Amino acid sequence: QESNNAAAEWKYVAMVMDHILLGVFMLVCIIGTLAVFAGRLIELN
Amino acid sequence: GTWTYDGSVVAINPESDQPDLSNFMESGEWVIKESRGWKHSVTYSCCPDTPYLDITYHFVMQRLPLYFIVNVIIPCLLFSFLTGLVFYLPTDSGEKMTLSISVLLSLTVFLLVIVELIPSTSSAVPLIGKYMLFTMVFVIASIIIT
Amino acid sequence: IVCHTTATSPISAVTCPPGENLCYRKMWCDAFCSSRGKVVELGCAATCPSKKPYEEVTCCSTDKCNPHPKQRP
Amino acid sequence: SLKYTAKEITLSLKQDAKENRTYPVEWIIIDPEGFTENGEWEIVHRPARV
Amino acid sequence: YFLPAQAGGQKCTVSINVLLAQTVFLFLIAQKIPETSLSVPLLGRFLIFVMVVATLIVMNCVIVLNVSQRTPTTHAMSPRLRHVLLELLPRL
Amino acid sequence: LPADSGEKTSVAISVLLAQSVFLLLISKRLPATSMAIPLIGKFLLFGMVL
Numbered sequence: 001q002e003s004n005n006a007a008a009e010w011k012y013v014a015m016v017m018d019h020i021l022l023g024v025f026m027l028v029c030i031i032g033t034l035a036v037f038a039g040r041l042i043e044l045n
Numbered sequence: 046g047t048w049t050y051d052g053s054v055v056a057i058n059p060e061s062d063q064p065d066l067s068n069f070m071e072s073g074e075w076v077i078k079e080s081r082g083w084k085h086s087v088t089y090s091c092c093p094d095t096p097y098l099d100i101t102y103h104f105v106m107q108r109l110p111l112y113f114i115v116n117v118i119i120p121c122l123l124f125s126f127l128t129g130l131v132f133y134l135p136t137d138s139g140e141k142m143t144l145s146i147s148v149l150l151s152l153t154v155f156l157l158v159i160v161e162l163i164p165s166t167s168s169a170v171p172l173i174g175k176y177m178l179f180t181m182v183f184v185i186a187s188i189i190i191t
Numbered sequence: 192i193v194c195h196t197t198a199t200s201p202i203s204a205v206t207c208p209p210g211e212n213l214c215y216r217k218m219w220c221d222a223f224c225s226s227r228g229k230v231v232e233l234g235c236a237a238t239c240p241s242k243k244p245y246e247e248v249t250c251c252s253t254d255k256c257n258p259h260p261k262q263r264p
Numbered sequence: 265s266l267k268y269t270a271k272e273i274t275l276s277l278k279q280d281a282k283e284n285r286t287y288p289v290e291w292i293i294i295d296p297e298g299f300t301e302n303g304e305w306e307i308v309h310r311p312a313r314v
Numbered sequence: 315y316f317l318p319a320q321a322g323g324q325k326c327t328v329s330i331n332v333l334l335a336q337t338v339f340l341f342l343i344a345q346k347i348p349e350t351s352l353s354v355p356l357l358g359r360f361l362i363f364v365m366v367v368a369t370l371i372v373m374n375c376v377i378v379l380n381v382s383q384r385t386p387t388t389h390a391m392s393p394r395l396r397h398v399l400l401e402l403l404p405r406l
Numbered sequence: 407l408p409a410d411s412g413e414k415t416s417v418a419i420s421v422l423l424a425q426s427v428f429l430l431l432i433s434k435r436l437p438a439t440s441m442a443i444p445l446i447g448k449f450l451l452f453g454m455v456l
């Protein structure tokens with residue numbers, strides 16, 4: 001049980017990392033998609 | 046312009062300030078926004094009295110983007126979107142690596158189709174090429190972090 | 192001031208419009224420098240024109256100081 | 265020339281002149297203003313030989 | 315949706331590889347369709363619809379795996395969602 | 407990548423597949439001469455061996 005709790009510590013750390021990275025990556029995706037096309041779509045309109 | 050006759054021997058004048066488009070068949074890919082004709086005379090240090098003449102006609106064409114938007118941009122955006130989902134997919138599933146690697150494979154198979162459509166003109170990177178590079182680096186970073 | 196100009200055909204001496212005083216001569220090569228020599232541009236300007244790396248430019252304030260190379264000042 | 269040989273025609277490079285001195289044009293002539301540079305290849309050298 | 319959301323399940327594998335197959339078809343289809351931009355072919359509209367739906371199914375598979383793989387050591391179960399999924403939905 | 411993930415061979419074999427795709431792409435762009443291996447071809451061969 002002690003070893004399982006020690007492993008669950010790492011698993012929880014990994015889950016928190018996952019939950020941070022999900023938002024970070026979605027924000028990076030949308031910002032990167034905007035940063036290319038926004039200027040040319042503004043010039044077009 | 047006249048190839049051999051110079052402006053002191055044969056003089057060419059534009060019939061009208063703009064090309065005649067009254068018979069123009071509409072293109073399925075390009076819209077001619079503007080057209081104009083200009084007569085240029087140039088004098089050379091050999092010969093003050095023999096100007097050389099040309100008429101330059103130019104057409105400002107804007108591409109219709111719909112084909113590339115539909116067949117290129119949309120699947121790249123879809124692959125980009127799926128890249129983030131690997132971080133919500135739990136590790137215990139074992140599907141994280143398969144998901145990210147299959148997204149990378151699909152992106153590479155799509156690059157195999159995109160490289161032939163993108164112009165090979167190496168003066169500057171196309172905007173779609175920069176977007177492809179962004180998507181590739183994004184997937185690579187996602188795999189490393191995963 | 193009066194400067195030679197290539198705006199008219201043939202080159203002629205024309206008094207500068209008000210606000211421009213400097214005569215200039217610009218010469219550069221093109222595809223026909225094999226026989227015709229450098230292109231020549233003559234005019235008057237309010238300031239000495241800019242020069243591309245392949246364009247020779249000369250600027251002077253005197254009258255008729257920008258002749259065609261085949262014409263004397 | 266295939267119709268004429270070195271006995272019939274003598275080929276030579278064009279001579280130009282500057283400052284009353286002639287010189288042979290030993291290079292491909294390129295317009296510095298109107299030559300649209302190619303999209304993939306930069307011309308580094310362009311000699312000519314007889 | 316019939317592949318178990320359990321260890322050994324291959325839900326995401328299937329969905330992503332079917333999307334890859336659809337991308338191979340997109341390569342194949344793009345050789346036949348002309349390059350004009352006046353309109354979008356019916357086959358092209360169907361292809362894009364299929365790809366969008368496939369990405370939605372990938373997202374749903376990821377969500378379902380994220381739900382099933384949870385553990386009491388990591389997630390506190392919401393009683394409202396518990397009642398809705400286990401009681402209200404069967405009663406609906 | 408940990409062995410308990412059960413995905414270690416998948417990554418390597420998929421990268422081999424991607425390198426195969428790149429070799430398919432590049433080999434269509436060059437003449438099949440025997441004078442030398444192109445630099446990108448040497449890199450591809452070395453990468454596939456590794």
Ligand SMILES: *[C@@H]1O[C@H](CO)[C@@H](O[C@@H]2O[C@H](CO)[C@@H](O[C@@H]3O[C@H](CO[C@H]4O[C@H](CO[C@H]5O[C@H](CO)[C@@H](O)[C@H](O)[C@@H]5O)[C@@H](O)[C@H](O[C@H]5O[C@H](CO)[C@@H](O)[C@H](O)[C@@H]5O)[C@@H]4O)[C@@H](O)[C@H](O[C@H]4O[C@H](CO)[C@@H](O)[C@H](O)[C@@H]4O)[C@@H]3O)[C@H](O)[C@H]2NC(C)=O)[C@H](O)[C@H]1NC(C)=O
Binds near residue numbers: 197198233
């Ligand atoms: C897309 O790309 C194309 C090129 O591929 C580009 O085309 C250029 O378009 C611009 C304008 O948009 C052009 O600029 C104009 O050029 C005119 C050329 O005129 C020549 O002749 C003039 C004298 O002739 C006059 O009189 C006769 C009969 O009386 C008549 O037929 C002529 O039309 C004209 O009225 C001469 O003055 C002029 O001068 C050039 O050369 C002299 C010396 O060599 C030099 O001093 C000048 O600087 C100039 O290089 C030339 O020989 C020109 O008339 C016209 O002038 C207008 O503007 C100037 C200042 O802007 C005013 O002073 C004047 O009153 C006029 O309003 C103007 O300069 C350019 O030549 C085109 N170039 C080519 C290669 O085609 C398109 O623009 C691009 N389009 C995009 C990106 O959308």
